[PDB]
Write an enzyme that holds these catalytic residues in place. Structure first.
Site, PDB file in Angstrom:
ATOM      1  N   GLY A   1       0.806  -1.203   0.000  1.00 53.21           N
ATOM      2  CA  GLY A   1       0.000   0.000   0.000  1.00 53.21           C
ATOM      3  C   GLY A   1       0.846   1.262   0.000  1.00 53.21           C
TER       4      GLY A   1
ATOM      5  N   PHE B   1       3.718   9.770   3.202  1.00 55.55           N
ATOM      6  CA  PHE B   1       4.942  10.302   2.608  1.00 55.55           C
ATOM      7  C   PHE B   1       5.710   9.333   1.704  1.00 55.55           C
ATOM      8  CE2 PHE B   1       4.430  12.036   7.016  1.00 55.55           C
ATOM      9  CZ  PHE B   1       3.947  13.283   6.671  1.00 55.55           C
TER      10      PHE B   1
ATOM     11  N   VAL C   1       5.087   1.718   0.722  1.00 54.17           N
ATOM     12  CA  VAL C   1       5.494   0.729   1.712  1.00 54.17           C
ATOM     13  C   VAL C   1       5.521  -0.641   1.058  1.00 54.17           C
ATOM     14  CG1 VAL C   1       5.115  -0.169   4.033  1.00 54.17           C
ATOM     15  CG2 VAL C   1       4.399   2.167   3.442  1.00 54.17           C
TER      16      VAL C   1
ATOM     17  N   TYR D   1       6.871  -6.114  10.463  1.00 51.62           N
ATOM     18  CA  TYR D   1       5.790  -6.510   9.564  1.00 51.62           C
ATOM     19  C   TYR D   1       4.691  -7.205  10.359  1.00 51.62           C
ATOM     20  CZ  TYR D   1       3.044  -8.507   5.819  1.00 51.62           C
ATOM     21  OH  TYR D   1       2.009  -8.840   4.980  1.00 51.62           O
TER      22      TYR D   1
ATOM     23  N   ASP E   1      -3.849   9.904  15.627  1.00 51.86           N
ATOM     24  CA  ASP E   1      -4.597   9.420  14.468  1.00 51.86           C
ATOM     25  C   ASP E   1      -5.136   8.014  14.726  1.00 51.86           C
ATOM     26  OD1 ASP E   1      -4.001   9.185  10.857  1.00 51.86           O
ATOM     27  OD2 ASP E   1      -5.789   9.699  11.997  1.00 51.86           O
TER      28      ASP E   1
HETATM   29  C1  LIG Z   1       0.103  -4.784   6.563  1.00 48.53           C
HETATM   30  N1  LIG Z   1       1.181  -4.907   7.522  1.00 48.53           N
HETATM   31  C2  LIG Z   1       1.996  -3.894   7.840  1.00 48.53           C
HETATM   32  N2  LIG Z   1       2.913  -4.139   8.785  1.00 48.53           N
HETATM   33  C3  LIG Z   1       3.679  -3.103   9.155  1.00 48.53           C
HETATM   34  C4  LIG Z   1       3.564  -1.837   8.575  1.00 48.53           C
HETATM   35  C5  LIG Z   1       4.356  -0.685   8.875  1.00 48.53           C
HETATM   36  C6  LIG Z   1       4.207   0.484   8.209  1.00 48.53           C
HETATM   37  C7  LIG Z   1       4.963   1.709   8.574  1.00 48.53           C
HETATM   38  C8  LIG Z   1       4.292   2.759   9.194  1.00 48.53           C
HETATM   39  C9  LIG Z   1       4.941   3.947   9.467  1.00 48.53           C
HETATM   40  C10 LIG Z   1       6.281   4.127   9.142  1.00 48.53           C
HETATM   41  C11 LIG Z   1       6.974   5.403   9.438  1.00 48.53           C
HETATM   42  C12 LIG Z   1       7.931   5.507  10.437  1.00 48.53           C
HETATM   43  C13 LIG Z   1       8.459   6.753  10.726  1.00 48.53           C
HETATM   44  C14 LIG Z   1       8.032   7.854  10.012  1.00 48.53           C
HETATM   45  C15 LIG Z   1       7.081   7.674   9.022  1.00 48.53           C
HETATM   46  C16 LIG Z   1       6.487   8.768   8.154  1.00 48.53           C
HETATM   47  F1  LIG Z   1       7.057   9.956   8.449  1.00 48.53           F
HETATM   48  F2  LIG Z   1       6.804   8.564   6.861  1.00 48.53           F
HETATM   49  N3  LIG Z   1       6.562   6.470   8.732  1.00 48.53           N
HETATM   50  C17 LIG Z   1       6.958   3.077   8.529  1.00 48.53           C
HETATM   51  C18 LIG Z   1       6.305   1.891   8.256  1.00 48.53           C
HETATM   52 CL1  LIG Z   1       7.220   0.625   7.508  1.00 48.53          CL
HETATM   53  C19 LIG Z   1       3.227   0.583   7.142  1.00 48.53           C
HETATM   54  O1  LIG Z   1       3.107   1.568   6.417  1.00 48.53           O
HETATM   55  N4  LIG Z   1       2.444  -0.523   6.901  1.00 48.53           N
HETATM   56  C20 LIG Z   1       1.358  -0.361   5.935  1.00 48.53           C
HETATM   57  C21 LIG Z   1       0.354   0.662   6.427  1.00 48.53           C
HETATM   58  O2  LIG Z   1      -0.451   0.088   7.429  1.00 48.53           O
HETATM   59  C22 LIG Z   1      -1.289   1.071   8.048  1.00 48.53           C
HETATM   60  C23 LIG Z   1      -2.112   1.833   7.018  1.00 48.53           C
HETATM   61  N5  LIG Z   1      -2.644   3.057   7.634  1.00 48.53           N
HETATM   62  C24 LIG Z   1      -1.292   2.188   5.781  1.00 48.53           C
HETATM   63  O3  LIG Z   1      -0.436   1.111   5.370  1.00 48.53           O
HETATM   64  C25 LIG Z   1       2.589  -1.723   7.574  1.00 48.53           C
HETATM   65  N6  LIG Z   1       1.793  -2.732   7.199  1.00 48.53           N
END
Ligand SMILES: CNc1ncc2cc(-c3ccc(-c4cccc(C(F)F)n4)cc3Cl)c(=O)n(C[C@H]3OC[C@H](N)CO3)c2n1
EC number: 2.7.11.1
Length: 264
Positions: free
Chosen positions: A18, A22, A25, A88, A131
């Site tokens: 998805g 910013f 992922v 993950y 959020d």
């Molecule tokens: C489906 N399983 C899964 N497992 C783990 C994750 C972990 C993350 C994730 C979140 C945030 C950051 C991050 C860190 C610091 C600063 C910032 C920002 F400043 F840029 N971001 C980094 C990561 Cl890696 C992720 O996007 N997803 C998909 C996500 O899930 C929720 C939905 N609202 C949208 O998609 C995930 N999905």
């Protein structure tokens, strides 16, 4: 943030999971441990005016050590791209898990209980999630429930005082909206234009949970959704709310919900 190591050697990038905040992922593999990670890749050339907010969320996550907050493993700068490595969680988001059909109140209570455990942790740490919503609640493949996607320090889950420009009680309002969302599939006003919702939330009476739901669940929602923040209970208190105590069960049972989403 590690400026010397090459993340493309350390991690194997797999399919997109998805579009996040910013950046895009991906599911990925830590080549040293073979554990699955989530990899967010942000083009720092394209997202210049937002770098401050990125470092702020990195800082907050690095300060979190809780079973209820998605684990942060580090970040890497390669050419113009910032790689952010997180745990993950293979169960998907709570929002994903609404898709096959309605949750029952045991599932709702269990997910809310675990969200509350995360909010209790953050608030005890003088942090605000900012959020809370079903899309930002992630499940492991074992049913563990964790918070992700902290808000920066769409309007449907916002507390009225946040919109009018607050403290941890804002998270409690957002939890009330999330409770409605888990029961009904979407938050209040979801059919309306966001600019309309921006003035409806401050002006209207708080939403209520409408439908054939138990009175404890309706009262849980009502307790969170008080216009007066000081009248909202704490996360600690809501963990003893009768709706939670009478309906929540072991998180491992949520694997049935995860399996249902894969067969759907
Ligand atoms: C489906 N399983 C899964 N497992 C783990 C994750 C972990 C993350 C994730 C979140 C945030 C950051 C991050 C860190 C610091 C600063 C910032 C920002 F400043 F840029 N971001 C980094 C990561 Cl890696 C992720 O996007 N997803 C998909 C996500 O899930 C929720 C939905 N609202 C949208 O998609 C995930 N999905």
């Amino acid at each position: 943030t590690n400026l010397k190591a090459d993340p493309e050697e350390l991690f194997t990038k797999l399919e997109k999971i998805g579009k996040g905040s910013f950046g895009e992922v991906f599911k990925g593999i830590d080549n040293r441990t073979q554990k699955v990670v989530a990899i967010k890749i942000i083009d720092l050339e394209e997202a210049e005016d937002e770098i401050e907010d990125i470092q702020q969320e990195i800082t907050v996550l690095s300060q979190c050590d809780s079973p209820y907050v998605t684990k942060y493993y580090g970040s890497y700068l390669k050419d113009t791209k910032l790689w952010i490595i997180m745990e993950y969680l293979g169960g998907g988001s709570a929002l994903d898990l609404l898709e096959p059909g309605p949750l029952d109140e045991t599932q709702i209570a269990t997910i809310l209980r675990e969200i509350l455990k995360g909010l209790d942790y953050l608030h005890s740490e003088k942090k605000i999630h900012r959020d809370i919503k079903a899309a930002n609640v992630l499940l492991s493949e074992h049913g563990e429930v964790k918070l992700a996607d902290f808000g920066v320090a769409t309007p449907f889950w916002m507390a009225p005082e946040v919109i009018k420009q607050y403290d941890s009680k804002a998270d409690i309002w957002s939890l009330g909206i999330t409770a409605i969302e888990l029961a009904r599939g979407e938050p209040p006003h979801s059919e309306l234009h966001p600019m309309k919702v921006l003035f409806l939330i401050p002006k209207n009476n708080p939403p209520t949970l409408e439908g054939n739901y138990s009175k404890p669940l309706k009262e849980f929602v009502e307790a969170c959704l008080n216009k007066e923040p000081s009248f909202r209970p704490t996360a600690k208190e809501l963990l003893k709310h009768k709706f939670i105590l009478r309906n929540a069960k072991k998180t491992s049972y949520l694997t049935e919900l995860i399996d249902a989403h894969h067969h759907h």
